[PDB]
Ligand SMILES: [Cl-]
């Protein structure tokens with residue numbers, strides 16, 4: 001299913017997250033998902 | 046400077062998140078922070 005969870009971010013990281021998500025027209029959850037998969041592919045299979 | 050945020054992940058992304066975090070000895074929060082800075086960088 002969908003899974004709900006609460007994370008803690010520094011204010012700077014959260015502000016950049018919002019900015020990036022808004023620039024891409026994504027929710028922050030979707031922006032984090034893209035970031036996680038980009039990182040995963042960028043180092044590992 | 047710490048702030049909370051609730052997010053929704055698919056189970057598949059959450060499992061990849063938990064594996065990566067365990068690998069690196071990081072909380073989910075810290076692993077997401079790493080991945081976000083890598084992504085921000087990637088331009
Ligand atoms: Cl959002």
Ligand SMILES: [Cl-]
Pocket residue numbers: 006007008072073074075
């Ligand atoms: Cl966490």
